[PDB]
């Protein structure tokens, strides 16, 4: 599961995941995940 390009390709995976995490934080579901 280790790659010589994962630490980078993942940086893009997280940056895009932040938009989703904050999306629900707006109160779409509340404190119930």
User: Hey, what are 17's tokens?
Assistant: 């995941």
d(CA 12, CA 16): 6
Do 1 and 10 touch, CB atoms closer than 8 A?
no
User: Hey, what are 20's tokens?
Assistant: 């989703």
Give me the half-sphere count of Cα atoms (radius 13 Å) on the Cβ side of residue 27.
Answer: 0
* C-alpha separations of 28 from 3, 7, 13, 23 in Å: 36, 31, 22, 8
Nearest-5° Cα angle at 11, 5 to 15: 155
DSSP strands (E only) in 1-33:
none
């Amino acid at each position: 599961r280790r790659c010589l390009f994962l630490p980078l390709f993942s940086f893009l995976i997280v940056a895009g995941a932040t938009t989703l995490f904050c999306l629900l934080h707006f109160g779409v579901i509340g404190p119930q995940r």
